Design a protein around this ligand. Sequence first.
Ligand SMILES: O=C(O)[C@H](O)[C@H](O)COP(=O)(O)O
Ligand SMILES: O=C(O)[C@H](O)[C@H](O)COP(=O)(O)O
Lengths: 157, 157
Amino acid sequence: GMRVYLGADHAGYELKQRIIEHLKQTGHEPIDCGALRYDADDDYPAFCIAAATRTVADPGSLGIVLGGSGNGEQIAANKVPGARCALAWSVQTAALAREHNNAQLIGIGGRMHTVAEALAIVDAFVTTPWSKAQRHQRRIDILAEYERTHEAPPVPG
Amino acid sequence: GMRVYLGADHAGYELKQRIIEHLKQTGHEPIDCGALRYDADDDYPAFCIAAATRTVADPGSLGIVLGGSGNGEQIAANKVPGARCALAWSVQTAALAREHNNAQLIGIGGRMHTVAEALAIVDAFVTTPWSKAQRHQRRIDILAEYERTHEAPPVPG
Ligand SMILES: O=C(O)[C@H](O)[C@H](O)COP(=O)(O)O
Ligand SMILES: O=C(O)[C@H](O)[C@H](O)COP(=O)(O)O
């Protein structure tokens, strides 16, 4: 049973309600960071930064941010210190997000998939374990060090 | 004509060389940030941080980071101040990245597409204009203010 913080604007609102319902029925614990109602003009960043911030402050938790394409949403979540948000557009990329990138969050576009395709992406995200492989941890540590100092590391040749 | 900064690890190296050749033949000026040769054990972060840094500091330029899925790469590019890197997995998401998110960069997974599909994603990226619409600019500005102060903007209600 995984804890999952969810964020969404209007474009990903309806899909977010289906995912919250799906996560409850599969033994997980969804927490809604907003939007709590449909509002056609609302802005995605605040909801994505809310979910990503709360995910980082609650180790072991995961996160899902929803928009039209999911791309503005993953960009916003990646600005949060300590957060790593992949865009999942398939079962494979959702699983590789966990296995290789140790991503605590994923973006998904509600306008890009059917309900059944989006829920299969969510399943792979919340069940695929992080591999802990040496090369993957090494890359995560290099990026985290850049996030600490904002001093770009030298390219290897 | 546009300067386009490209970064890639071993997983996106062979596709990066193909994209550099395609950009030369379509009137653009590709600049290789690395890797310059195939090294199977090299790490993506430094190449993506270099491409994203140089893109943001160069007005009118774009950038492309390549990997296996492209997700580790866009995550690294998104840690750079000012950068906005979408994950492009189709012609629609490459075009929407420009139109809606004003993304200076995109990540592409070399293992996820054929060569022909990936080059069509690049074509949509470098030819789709930034819409400059009010709501799109407002959301970019909310996120840039969060980058500056790290003050999470309040959720409506
Ligand atoms: O894809 C995104 O990041 C946004 O959800 C999308 O740009 C919203 O666009 P709108 O619904 O305002 O046309
Ligand atoms: O897609 C990525 O994030 C990386 O390019 C990928 O994890 C590299 O893994 P490797 O090629 O070392 O298996």
